Amino acid sequence: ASSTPQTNVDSMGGGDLTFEDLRDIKDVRDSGGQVAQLMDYKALLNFGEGCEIHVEGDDETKQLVDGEPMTLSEW
Amino acid sequence: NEAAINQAIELHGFPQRHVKVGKEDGAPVRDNDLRRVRTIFDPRTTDANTAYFTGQDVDVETLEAHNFDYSAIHEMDMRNLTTALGLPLEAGNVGADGLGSGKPAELRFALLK
């Protein structure tokens, strides 16, 4: 096979979106009301329960970081 | 919308008495004549079991209480406000069908939490 994509990727040089379009997204977001609350609920459903970091073989990573033992997950 | 409902209840929530005096195409009645009729039919001095005796050319009409669904307007206003402030509708003392139970309820209370 090959080390570069040999298929093309359907965009360069244009005629995808402007700073004006980016500021329209900002306007919808800051305008409040029902649309903004629904898309905030969407963000809360996807990302609102927070997170956990897992390293596989974390115990093997034990190293003195600054005169104290840490695993990579602890770091 | 709250102020509009309050003003509308005063004007339209209660019946009002309309006394019509004179025959149609009859003799005209003037303001000073109506002052004496006003004295007879005054809602201030009227009691619940008053009876009226008249000739044929006095009509005691009623402006009815005109129906509008102020309850539905309140629910709509409260839904808009609660959804805008991100509270569940129940915080506004307003209920909704189907949303009070099961996985629908679980989702909305999970969203709040």
Side-chain angles (χ1 to χ4, degrees):
Chain A
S2 57
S3 293
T4 54
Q6 58 194 46
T7 53
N8 303 329
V9 198
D10 209 39
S11 183
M12 197 178 181
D16 196 36
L17 77 170
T18 69
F19 291 119
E20 313 313 315
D21 309 305
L22 263 43
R23 288 192 190 259
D24 286 356
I25 305 161
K26 171 67 186 299
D27 282 357
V28 178
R29 194 166 197 259
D30 83 14
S31 69
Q34 309 195 52
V35 176
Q37 191 63 44
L38 283 164
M39 184 69 75
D40 286 351
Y41 289 157
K42 195 181 176 76
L44 288 168
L45 283 164
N46 285 271
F47 300 110
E49 280 288 1
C51 70
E52 186 164 12
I53 301 158
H54 300 284
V55 177
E56 189 57 280
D58 185 61
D59 300 302
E60 313 308 327
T61 70
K62 280 279 284 294
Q63 179 158 222
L64 299 176
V65 164
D66 190 9
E68 182 171 23
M70 297 195 187
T71 59
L72 177 57
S73 65
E74 284 162 320
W75 188 86
Chain B
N1 284 358
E2 280 280 10
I5 292 165
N6 191 262
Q7 178 70 343
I9 291 289
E10 177 157 49
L11 296 171
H12 310 281
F14 306 95
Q16 294 187 315
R17 190 154 285 156
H18 189 188
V19 178
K20 261 169 161 160
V21 188
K23 203 163 86 77
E24 191 173 37
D25 310 322
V29 181
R30 278 46 180 276
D31 286 352
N32 282 333
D33 313 323
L34 292 180
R35 289 181 171 117
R36 289 167 171 98
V37 182
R38 180 173 67 189
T39 303
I40 297 158
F41 288 92
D42 195 357
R44 177 185 55 116
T45 65
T46 295
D47 75 62
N49 294 294
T50 307
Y52 301 107
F53 297 84
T54 77
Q56 289 294 340
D57 307 317
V58 182
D59 294 315
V60 190
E61 301 299 343
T62 290
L63 281 164
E64 297 181 342
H66 290 119
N67 282 314
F68 69 111
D69 202 344
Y70 49 94
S71 300
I73 305 169
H74 268 130
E75 288 181 19
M76 189 203 69
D77 293 336
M78 194 59 71
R79 194 186 318 259
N80 290 354
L81 184 67
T82 53
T83 305
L85 300 185
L87 290 161
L89 181 52
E90 291 67 31
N93 302 105
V94 165
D97 296 345
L99 289 179
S101 192
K103 293 208 161 290
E106 291 185 342
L107 179 92
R108 296 203 324 300
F109 299 110
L111 278 172
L112 179 63
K113 287 184 278 187

